Short mmCIF file of C-alpha atoms in Angstrom, two decimals:
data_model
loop_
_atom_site.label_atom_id
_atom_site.label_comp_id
_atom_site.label_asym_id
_atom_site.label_seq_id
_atom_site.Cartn_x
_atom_site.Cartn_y
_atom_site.Cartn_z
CA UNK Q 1 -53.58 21.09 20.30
CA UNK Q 2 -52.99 17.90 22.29
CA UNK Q 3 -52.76 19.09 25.97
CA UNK Q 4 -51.34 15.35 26.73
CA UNK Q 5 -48.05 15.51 27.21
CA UNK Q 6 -48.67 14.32 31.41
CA UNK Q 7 -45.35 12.73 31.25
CA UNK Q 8 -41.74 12.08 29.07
CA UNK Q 9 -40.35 9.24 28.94
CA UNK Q 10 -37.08 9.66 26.61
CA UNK Q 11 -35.22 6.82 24.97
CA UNK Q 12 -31.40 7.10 25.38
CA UNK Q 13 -30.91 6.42 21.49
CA UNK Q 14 -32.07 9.62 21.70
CA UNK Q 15 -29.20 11.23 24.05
CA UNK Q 16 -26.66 9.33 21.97
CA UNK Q 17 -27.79 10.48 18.35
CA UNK Q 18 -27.95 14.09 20.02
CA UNK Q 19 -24.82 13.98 21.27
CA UNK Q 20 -23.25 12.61 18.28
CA UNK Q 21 -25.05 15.21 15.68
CA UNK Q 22 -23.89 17.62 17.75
CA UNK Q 23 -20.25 17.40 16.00
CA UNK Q 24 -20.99 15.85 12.27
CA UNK Q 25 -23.09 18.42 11.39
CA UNK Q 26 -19.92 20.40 13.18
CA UNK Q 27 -21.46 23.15 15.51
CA UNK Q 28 -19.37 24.06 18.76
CA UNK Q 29 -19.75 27.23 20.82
CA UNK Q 30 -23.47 27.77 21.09
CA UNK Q 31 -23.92 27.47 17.70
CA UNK Q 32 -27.44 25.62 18.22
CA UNK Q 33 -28.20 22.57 16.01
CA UNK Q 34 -32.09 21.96 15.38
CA UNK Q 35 -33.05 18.42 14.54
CA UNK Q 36 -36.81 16.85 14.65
CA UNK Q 37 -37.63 13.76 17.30
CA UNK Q 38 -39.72 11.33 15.92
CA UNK Q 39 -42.31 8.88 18.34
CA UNK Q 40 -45.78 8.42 19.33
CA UNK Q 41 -48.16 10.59 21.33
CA UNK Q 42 -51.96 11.23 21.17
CA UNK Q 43 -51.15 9.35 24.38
CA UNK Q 44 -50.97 10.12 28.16
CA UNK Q 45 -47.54 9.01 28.65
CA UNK Q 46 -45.07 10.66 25.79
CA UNK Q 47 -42.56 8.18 24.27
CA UNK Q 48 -40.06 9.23 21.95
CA UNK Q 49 -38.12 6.88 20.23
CA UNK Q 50 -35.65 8.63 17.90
CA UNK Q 51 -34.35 11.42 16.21
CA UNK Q 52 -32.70 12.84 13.23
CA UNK Q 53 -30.88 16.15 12.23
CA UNK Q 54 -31.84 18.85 10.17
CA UNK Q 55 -29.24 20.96 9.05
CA UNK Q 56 -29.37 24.71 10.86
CA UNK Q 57 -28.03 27.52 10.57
CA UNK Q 58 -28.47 30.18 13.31
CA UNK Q 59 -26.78 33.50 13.12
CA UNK Q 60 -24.64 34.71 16.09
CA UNK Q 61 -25.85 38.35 16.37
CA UNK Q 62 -29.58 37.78 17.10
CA UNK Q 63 -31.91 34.71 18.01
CA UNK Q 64 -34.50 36.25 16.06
CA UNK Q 65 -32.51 35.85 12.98
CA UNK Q 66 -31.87 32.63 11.92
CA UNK Q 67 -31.69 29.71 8.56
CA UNK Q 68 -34.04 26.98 8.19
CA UNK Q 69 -34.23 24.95 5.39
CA UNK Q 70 -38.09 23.36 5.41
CA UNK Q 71 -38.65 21.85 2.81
CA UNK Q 72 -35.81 19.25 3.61
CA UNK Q 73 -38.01 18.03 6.67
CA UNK Q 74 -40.35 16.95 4.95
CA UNK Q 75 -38.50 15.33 2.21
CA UNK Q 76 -36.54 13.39 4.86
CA UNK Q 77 -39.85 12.70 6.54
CA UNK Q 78 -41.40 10.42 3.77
CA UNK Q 79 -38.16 8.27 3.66
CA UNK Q 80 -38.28 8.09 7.18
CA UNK Q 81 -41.52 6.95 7.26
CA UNK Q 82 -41.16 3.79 4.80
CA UNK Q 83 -38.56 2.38 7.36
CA UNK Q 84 -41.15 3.23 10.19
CA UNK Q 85 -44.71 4.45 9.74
CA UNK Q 86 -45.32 4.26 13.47
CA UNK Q 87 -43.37 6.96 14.04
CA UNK Q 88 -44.94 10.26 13.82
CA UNK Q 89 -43.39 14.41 13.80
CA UNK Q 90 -44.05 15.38 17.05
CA UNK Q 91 -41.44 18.11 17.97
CA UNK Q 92 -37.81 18.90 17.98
CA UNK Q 93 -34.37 18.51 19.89
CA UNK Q 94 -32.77 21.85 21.47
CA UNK Q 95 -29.16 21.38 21.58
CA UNK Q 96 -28.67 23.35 24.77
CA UNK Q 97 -27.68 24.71 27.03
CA UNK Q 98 -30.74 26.40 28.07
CA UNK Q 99 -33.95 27.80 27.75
CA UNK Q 100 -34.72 30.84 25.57
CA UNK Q 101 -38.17 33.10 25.33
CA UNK Q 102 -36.69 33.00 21.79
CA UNK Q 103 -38.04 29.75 21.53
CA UNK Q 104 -41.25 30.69 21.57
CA UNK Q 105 -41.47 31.64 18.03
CA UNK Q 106 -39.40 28.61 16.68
CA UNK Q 107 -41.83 26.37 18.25
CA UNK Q 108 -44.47 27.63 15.97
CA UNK Q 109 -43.25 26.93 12.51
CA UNK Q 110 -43.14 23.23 13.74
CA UNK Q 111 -46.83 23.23 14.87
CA UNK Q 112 -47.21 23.79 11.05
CA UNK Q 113 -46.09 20.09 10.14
CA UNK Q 114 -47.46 18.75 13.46
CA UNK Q 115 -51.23 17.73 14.53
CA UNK Q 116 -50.19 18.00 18.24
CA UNK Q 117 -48.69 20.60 19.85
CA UNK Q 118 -44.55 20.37 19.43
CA UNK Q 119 -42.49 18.76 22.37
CA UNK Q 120 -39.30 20.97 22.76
CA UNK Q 121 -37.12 18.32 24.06
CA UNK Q 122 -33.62 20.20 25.67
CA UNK Q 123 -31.06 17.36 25.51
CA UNK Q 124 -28.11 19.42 27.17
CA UNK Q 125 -25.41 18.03 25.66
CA UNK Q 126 -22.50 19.06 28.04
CA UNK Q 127 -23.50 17.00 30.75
CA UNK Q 128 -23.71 19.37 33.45
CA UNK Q 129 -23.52 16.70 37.04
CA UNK Q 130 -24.47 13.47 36.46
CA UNK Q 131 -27.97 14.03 37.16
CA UNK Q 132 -30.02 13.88 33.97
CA UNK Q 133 -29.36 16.20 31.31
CA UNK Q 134 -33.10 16.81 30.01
CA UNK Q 135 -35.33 19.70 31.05
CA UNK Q 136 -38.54 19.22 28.86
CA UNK Q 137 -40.45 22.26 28.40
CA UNK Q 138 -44.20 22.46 25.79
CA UNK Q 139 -45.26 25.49 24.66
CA UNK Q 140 -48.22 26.46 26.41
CA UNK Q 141 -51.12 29.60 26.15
CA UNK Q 142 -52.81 30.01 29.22
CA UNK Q 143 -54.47 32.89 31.08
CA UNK Q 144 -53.56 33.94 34.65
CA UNK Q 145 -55.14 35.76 37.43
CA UNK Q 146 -51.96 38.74 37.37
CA UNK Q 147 -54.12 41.31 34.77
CA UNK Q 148 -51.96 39.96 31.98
CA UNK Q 149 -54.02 39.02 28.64
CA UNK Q 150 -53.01 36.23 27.96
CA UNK Q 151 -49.43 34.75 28.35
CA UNK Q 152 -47.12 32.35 26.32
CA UNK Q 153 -45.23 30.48 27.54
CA UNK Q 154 -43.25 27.34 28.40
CA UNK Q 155 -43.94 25.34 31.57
CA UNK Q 156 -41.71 22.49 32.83
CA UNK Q 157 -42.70 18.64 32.52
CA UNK Q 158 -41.05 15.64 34.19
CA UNK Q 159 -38.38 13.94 32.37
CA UNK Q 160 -37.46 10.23 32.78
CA UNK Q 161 -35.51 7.84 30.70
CA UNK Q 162 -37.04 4.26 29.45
CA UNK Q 163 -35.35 1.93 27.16
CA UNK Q 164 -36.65 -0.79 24.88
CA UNK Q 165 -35.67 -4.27 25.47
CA UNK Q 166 -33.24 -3.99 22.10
CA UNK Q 167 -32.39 -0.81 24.14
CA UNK Q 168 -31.42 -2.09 27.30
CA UNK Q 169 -29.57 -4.92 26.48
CA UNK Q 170 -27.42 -2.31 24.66
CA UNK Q 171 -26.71 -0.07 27.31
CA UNK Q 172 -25.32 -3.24 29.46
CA UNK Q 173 -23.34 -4.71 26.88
CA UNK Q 174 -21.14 -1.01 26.78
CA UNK Q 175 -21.07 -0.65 29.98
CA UNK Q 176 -18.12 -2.19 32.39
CA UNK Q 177 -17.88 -0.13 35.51
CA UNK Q 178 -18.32 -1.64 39.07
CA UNK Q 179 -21.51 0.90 39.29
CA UNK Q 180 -22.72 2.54 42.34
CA UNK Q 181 -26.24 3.47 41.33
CA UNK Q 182 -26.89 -0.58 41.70
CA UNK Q 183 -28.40 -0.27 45.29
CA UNK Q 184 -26.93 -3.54 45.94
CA UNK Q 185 -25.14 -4.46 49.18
CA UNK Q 186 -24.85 -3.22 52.11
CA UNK Q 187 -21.88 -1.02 50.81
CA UNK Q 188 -23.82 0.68 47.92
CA UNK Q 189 -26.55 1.48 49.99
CA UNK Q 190 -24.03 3.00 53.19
CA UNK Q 191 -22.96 5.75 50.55
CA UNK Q 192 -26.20 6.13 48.83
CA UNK Q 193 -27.66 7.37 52.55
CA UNK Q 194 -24.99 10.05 52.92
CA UNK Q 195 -25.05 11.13 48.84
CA UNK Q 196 -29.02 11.56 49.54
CA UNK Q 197 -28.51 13.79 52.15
CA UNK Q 198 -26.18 16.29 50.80
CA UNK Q 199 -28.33 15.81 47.15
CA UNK Q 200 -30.86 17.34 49.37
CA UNK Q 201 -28.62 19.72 51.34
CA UNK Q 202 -27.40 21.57 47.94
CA UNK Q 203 -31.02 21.54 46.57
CA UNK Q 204 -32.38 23.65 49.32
CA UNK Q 205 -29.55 25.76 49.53
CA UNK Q 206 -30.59 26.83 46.02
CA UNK Q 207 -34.15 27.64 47.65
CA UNK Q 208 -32.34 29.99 50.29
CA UNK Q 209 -30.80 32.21 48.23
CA UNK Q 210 -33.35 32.35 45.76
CA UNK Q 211 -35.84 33.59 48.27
CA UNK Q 212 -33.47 36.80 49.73
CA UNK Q 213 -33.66 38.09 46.10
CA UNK Q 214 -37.42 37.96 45.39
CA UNK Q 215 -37.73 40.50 48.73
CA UNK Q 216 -34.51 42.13 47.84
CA UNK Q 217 -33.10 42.50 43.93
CA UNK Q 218 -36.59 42.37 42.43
CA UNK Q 219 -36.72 38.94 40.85
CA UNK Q 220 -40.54 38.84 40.37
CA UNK Q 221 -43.15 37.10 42.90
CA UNK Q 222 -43.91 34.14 41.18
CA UNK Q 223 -46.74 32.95 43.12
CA UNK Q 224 -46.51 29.57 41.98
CA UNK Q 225 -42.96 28.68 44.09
CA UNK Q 226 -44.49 30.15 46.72
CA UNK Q 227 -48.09 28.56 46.85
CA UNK Q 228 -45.57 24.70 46.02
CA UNK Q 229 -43.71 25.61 49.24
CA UNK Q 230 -47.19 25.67 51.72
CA UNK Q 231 -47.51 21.85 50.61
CA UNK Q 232 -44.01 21.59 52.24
CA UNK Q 233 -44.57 23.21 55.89
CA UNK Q 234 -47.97 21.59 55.99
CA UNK Q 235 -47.21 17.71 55.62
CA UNK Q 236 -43.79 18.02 57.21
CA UNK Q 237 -43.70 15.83 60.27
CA UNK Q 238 -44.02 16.05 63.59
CA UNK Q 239 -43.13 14.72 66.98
CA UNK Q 240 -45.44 13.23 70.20
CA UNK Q 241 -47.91 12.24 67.73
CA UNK Q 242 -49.03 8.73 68.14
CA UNK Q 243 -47.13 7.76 64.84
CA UNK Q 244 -43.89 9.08 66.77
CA UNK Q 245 -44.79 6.32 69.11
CA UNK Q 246 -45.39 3.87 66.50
CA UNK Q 247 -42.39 4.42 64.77
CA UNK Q 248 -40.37 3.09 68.40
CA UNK Q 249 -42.76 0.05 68.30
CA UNK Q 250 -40.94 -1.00 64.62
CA UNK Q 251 -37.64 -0.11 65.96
CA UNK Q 252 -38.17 -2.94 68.34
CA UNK Q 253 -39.01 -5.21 66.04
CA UNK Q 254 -36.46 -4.70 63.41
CA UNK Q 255 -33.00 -4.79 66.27
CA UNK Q 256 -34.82 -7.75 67.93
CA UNK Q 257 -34.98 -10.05 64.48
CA UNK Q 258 -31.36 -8.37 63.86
CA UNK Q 259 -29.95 -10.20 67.10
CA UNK Q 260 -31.79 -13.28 66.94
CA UNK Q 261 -30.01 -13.75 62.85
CA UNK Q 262 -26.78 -12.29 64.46
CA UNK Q 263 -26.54 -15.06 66.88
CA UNK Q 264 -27.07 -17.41 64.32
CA UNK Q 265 -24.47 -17.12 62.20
CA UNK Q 266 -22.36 -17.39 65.15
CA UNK Q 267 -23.21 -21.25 65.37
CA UNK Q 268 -22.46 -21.52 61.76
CA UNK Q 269 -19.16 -20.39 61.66
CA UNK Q 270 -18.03 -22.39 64.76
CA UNK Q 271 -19.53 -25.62 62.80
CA UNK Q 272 -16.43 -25.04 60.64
CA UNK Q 273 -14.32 -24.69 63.41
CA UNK Q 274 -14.59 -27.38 64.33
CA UNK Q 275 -14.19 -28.81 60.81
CA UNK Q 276 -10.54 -27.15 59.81
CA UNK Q 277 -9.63 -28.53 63.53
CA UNK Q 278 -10.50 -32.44 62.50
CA UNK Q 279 -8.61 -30.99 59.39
CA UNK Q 280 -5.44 -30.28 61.58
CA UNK Q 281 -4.99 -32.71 64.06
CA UNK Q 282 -5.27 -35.79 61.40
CA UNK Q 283 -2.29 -33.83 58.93
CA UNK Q 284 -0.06 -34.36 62.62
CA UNK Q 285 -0.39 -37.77 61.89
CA UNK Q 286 0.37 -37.15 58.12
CA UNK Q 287 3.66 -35.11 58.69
CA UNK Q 288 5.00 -38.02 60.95
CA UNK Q 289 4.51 -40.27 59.07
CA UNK Q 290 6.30 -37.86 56.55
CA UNK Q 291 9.63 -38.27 57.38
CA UNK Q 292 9.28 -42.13 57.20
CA UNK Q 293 8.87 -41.94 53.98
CA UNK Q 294 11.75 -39.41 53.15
CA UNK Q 295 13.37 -41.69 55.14
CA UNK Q 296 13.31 -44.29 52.04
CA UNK Q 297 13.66 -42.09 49.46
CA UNK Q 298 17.05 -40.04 50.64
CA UNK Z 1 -40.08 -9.79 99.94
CA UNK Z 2 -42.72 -7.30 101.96
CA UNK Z 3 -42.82 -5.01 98.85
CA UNK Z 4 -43.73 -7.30 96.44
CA UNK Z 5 -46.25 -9.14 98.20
CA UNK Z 6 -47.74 -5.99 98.99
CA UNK Z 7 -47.70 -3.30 97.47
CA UNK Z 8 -49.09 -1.02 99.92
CA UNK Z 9 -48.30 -1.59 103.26
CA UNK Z 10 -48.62 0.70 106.74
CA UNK Z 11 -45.47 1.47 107.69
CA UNK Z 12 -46.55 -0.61 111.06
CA UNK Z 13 -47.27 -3.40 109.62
CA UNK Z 14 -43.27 -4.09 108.33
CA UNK Z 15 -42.49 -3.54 112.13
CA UNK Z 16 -44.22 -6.43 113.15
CA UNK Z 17 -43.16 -8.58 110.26
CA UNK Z 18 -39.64 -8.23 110.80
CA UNK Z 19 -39.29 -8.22 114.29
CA UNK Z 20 -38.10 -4.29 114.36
CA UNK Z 21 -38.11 -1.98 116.94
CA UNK Z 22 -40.14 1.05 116.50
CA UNK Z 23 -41.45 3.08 113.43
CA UNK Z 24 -38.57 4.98 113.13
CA UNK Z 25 -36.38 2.22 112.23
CA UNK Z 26 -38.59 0.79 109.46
CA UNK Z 27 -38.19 4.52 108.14
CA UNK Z 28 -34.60 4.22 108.30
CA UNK Z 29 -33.95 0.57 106.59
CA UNK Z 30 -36.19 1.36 103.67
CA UNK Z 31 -34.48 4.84 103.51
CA UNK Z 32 -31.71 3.83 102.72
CA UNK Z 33 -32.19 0.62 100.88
CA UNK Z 34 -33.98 2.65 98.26
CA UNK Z 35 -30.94 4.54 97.81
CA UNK Z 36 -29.69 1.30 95.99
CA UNK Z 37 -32.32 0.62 94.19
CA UNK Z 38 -32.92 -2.95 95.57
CA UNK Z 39 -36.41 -2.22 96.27
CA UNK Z 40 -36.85 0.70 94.22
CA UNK Z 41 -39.80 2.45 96.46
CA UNK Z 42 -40.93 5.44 97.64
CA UNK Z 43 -42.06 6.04 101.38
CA UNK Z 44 -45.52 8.29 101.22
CA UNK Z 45 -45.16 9.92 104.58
CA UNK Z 46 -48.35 11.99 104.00
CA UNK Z 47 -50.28 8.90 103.72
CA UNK Z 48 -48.06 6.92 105.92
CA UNK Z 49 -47.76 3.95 103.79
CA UNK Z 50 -45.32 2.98 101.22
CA UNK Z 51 -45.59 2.68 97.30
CA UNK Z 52 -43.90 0.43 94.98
CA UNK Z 53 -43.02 1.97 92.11
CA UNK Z 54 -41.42 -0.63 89.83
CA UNK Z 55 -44.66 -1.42 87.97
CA UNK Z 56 -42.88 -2.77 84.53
CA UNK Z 57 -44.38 -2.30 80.70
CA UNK Z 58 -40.58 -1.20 79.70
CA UNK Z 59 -41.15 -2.64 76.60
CA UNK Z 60 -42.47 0.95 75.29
CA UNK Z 61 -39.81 2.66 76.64
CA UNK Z 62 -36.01 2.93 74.51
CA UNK Z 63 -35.22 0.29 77.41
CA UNK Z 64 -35.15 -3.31 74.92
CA UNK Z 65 -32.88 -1.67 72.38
#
């Protein structure tokens, strides 16, 4: 069906009610509860605005085996609907932790109710790092070049977080740490250098590893890693281009306006020197004059 | 003061400027005044003249920072 789904923006309402579900409806230890997200689409950008639970069942044996009740969705729907008509069925919430080729087939019976093609939206609920705890994933049917006639499948799509303006203003009335993820002052910023460096430094160590078992424990060649890492060696920099000389010209620049405002606050400082020194030799007179006055009083 | 006023010079023509000697002496004052750095040349025997050297634009060089 709809083929837009570009982007996700996901509203943290969202996490929360997943999160939440999670234990009312009582399922611990990969016992995986289904519920439908509700929002608009038809539309470049995806925005999905809330959720609700269904109740599911799902046995432990087999993925293939499983309870759905359907009928309750859409009885809850038309409910749903009087509150909000905006809203529209347009997929459903995974519980985590991960991705199944089980999935396939549950995506399917939801395409039934819906006139674009189902978002599966994995909220991960056990907040593995604190990097963000959505991988979105649409069910997809596309050819490909291999010999294979025709593959299913689910491909990747960027994940983001938006809140509304009702939203937002919740989020900062919860929260009450100091934060770090502010990008404030000089301090916030020193660490955030160092913490992007070793973000980076565990990322591509995942890269390494990966690539010694395509060549060695037959993971298969998935061309498409390996046709996204050409981009990488082609446009990575290099040195004793005329840039490399340009880049020295803005070093200049940026140290020479950084000693010109250093020496300036210099002169404002020693402005107050001079100040708490007025300050000091007139209380001299004052403590004198002091004892004059005890003088009376004893 | 001969070196930057003129930037190549003879080596003769010093001789007569500052009073001294003989050829060989020039050679020998500049020698090892550019040791130091003070007047930062470099004698061209070949050519028998002398170079300066010091010829500035340090500004896109590491030198400011």
């Amino acid at each position: 069906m709809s083929l837009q789904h570009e982007k996700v923006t996901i509203a943290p309402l969202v996490l929360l009610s997943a999160l939440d579900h999670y234990e009312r409806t009582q399922t611990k230890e990969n016992k995986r509860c289904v519920g439908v997200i509700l929002g608009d689409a038809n539309s470049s950008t995806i925005r999905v605005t809330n959720s609700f639970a269904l109740p599911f069942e799902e046995d432990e044996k087999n993925s293939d085996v499983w309870f759905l009740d359907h009928n309750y969705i859409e009885n809850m729907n038309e409910m749903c609907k009087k509150i909000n008509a905006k809203e529209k069925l347009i997929g459903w919430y995974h519980s985590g932790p991960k991705l199944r080729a089980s999935d396939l087939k549950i995506n399917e019976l939801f395409k039934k109710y819906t006139q674009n093609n189902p978002l599966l939206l994995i909220v991960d609920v056990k907040q593995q790092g604190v990097g963000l705890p959505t991988d979105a994933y649409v069910a997809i049917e596309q050819v490909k070049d291999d010999g294979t006639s025709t593959e299913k499948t689910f491909l990747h799509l960027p994940c983001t977080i938006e809140a509304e303006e009702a939203e937002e203003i919740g989020v900062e009335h919860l929260l009450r740490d100091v934060r770090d993820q502010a990008a404030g002052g000089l301090s916030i910023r020193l660490t955030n250098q160092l913490k992007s460096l070793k973000g980076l430094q565990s990322k591509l160590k995942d890269v390494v590893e990966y690539l010694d078992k395509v060549i060695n424990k037959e993971l298969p060649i998935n061309h498409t890693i390996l046709g996204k890492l050409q981009d990488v060696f082609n446009l990575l920099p290099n040195l004793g281009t005329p840039d490399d000389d340009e880049i020295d010209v803005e070093n200049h620049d940026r140290i020479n306006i950084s000693n010109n405002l250093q020496k300036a606050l210099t002169v404002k400082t020693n402005d107050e020197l001079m100040v708490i020194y007025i300050s000091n030799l007139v209380r001299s007179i004052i403590a004198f004059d002091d004892l004059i006055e005890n003088k009376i009083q004893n | 003061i001969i070196s930057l006023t003129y930037k190549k010079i003879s080596l003769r023509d010093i001789c007569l400027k500052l009073n001294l000697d003989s050829e060989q002496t020039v050679e020998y004052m500049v020698s090892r005044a550019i040791r130091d750095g003070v007047i930062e040349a470099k004698i061209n025997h070949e050519d028998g003249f002398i170079e300066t050297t010091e010829l500035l634009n340090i500004y896109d060089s590491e030198d400011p920072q």
